[model samples]
Target: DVDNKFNKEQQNAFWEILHLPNLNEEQRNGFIQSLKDDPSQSANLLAEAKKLNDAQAPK
Candidate 1:
């Protein structure tokens, strides 16, 4: 069975803040772009999370 995936705590924290109701589009976009701008760092965080999840899954 396929299971749900979760992001690392830090990334999830960023996402939680991103989705706050008070944030305007420009502010949200700025946060998104900040992630996009540092591709290596963002990718590394996601990749590591995926690796951890995959390692814990049943075959």
Candidate 2:
């Protein structure tokens, strides 16, 4: 399950994207609904972060 509270970094990033100046209500609501429906979305984001880190590591 997605944590009930977001860390500061997570909150900041979320607001940055979801509240971007150009987004209309529909887009914002769609994102909200997706999060609500799938708590694993947070884990998926973390997984992506891990992948990014791995890719950036020296080979």
Candidate 3:
């Protein structure tokens, strides 16, 4: 398996971005690029993304 070289935090952030509701393709790319652009920010970015994702409780 040729997996990408990202730490646990990056992996979490990427996962959050992938499941981020309502983001268009471009927006999704931006989210992922943001992480690549700054690994240090991944923690904060993931926190916010996760919060937003969790806020939507579709029944």
Candidate 4:
């Protein structure tokens, strides 16, 4: 389910957002659950999150 969980950048961003003072825990918790619940969106968000990893990588 978490294909891009392997991407360190996505992992970093998730942790960063998780620790942000203003972020809503309910929403983030729901999104985390939804990633497991919704196959389509799960892959979609990861696709973009993984773009972040690509940027961090060497060409």
Cα error, residue 1 of model 2, in Å, equals 12
Q: For candidate 4, give the lDDT of residue 54.
A: 42
Ranking of models by lDDT? 3, 4, 2, 1
Instruction: Please list the residue runs of candidate 2 whose C-alpha ends up more than 4 Å from where it truly belongs after superposition.
Output: 1-10, 43-59
| Residue 30 accuracy (lDDT) in model 3 | 63
Question: Model 1, 1-59: lDDT tens per residue?
Answer: 32255346645636654444554456455455555566446554444433333443444
For all predicted structures, in order, the TM-scores are 0.36, 0.42, 0.57, 0.37
Give the per-residue lDDT digits (tens) of candidate 2, residues 1-59. Answer: 55676656556445544434444556555555555676557445433433333443444
CA lDDT of every candidate: 0.48, 0.50, 0.64, 0.51
Q: After superposition, how far is residue 45 of candidate 3 from its true place, in Å?
A: 1.4
**Candidate 1, superposed: residue stretches over 4 Å from native:** 1-14, 40-59
Full-model lDDT, candidate 4? 0.51
lDDT of 1 at 44: 47
lDDT of 3 by residue, 1-59 (tens): 33366676567567667776655456667666666676778787776665654455553
Local accuracy of candidate 4 as per-residue lDDT tens digits, 1-59: 35653544546545643653444466456446655676545546554544444453444
Better of 1 and 4 by TM-score: 4
lDDT of 4 at 14: 59
Native-to-model Cα distance after best TM-score fit, residue 18 in candidate 1, in Å:
4.0
Pick out the ten consecutive residues of candidate 3 with the lowest summed lDDT: 50-59
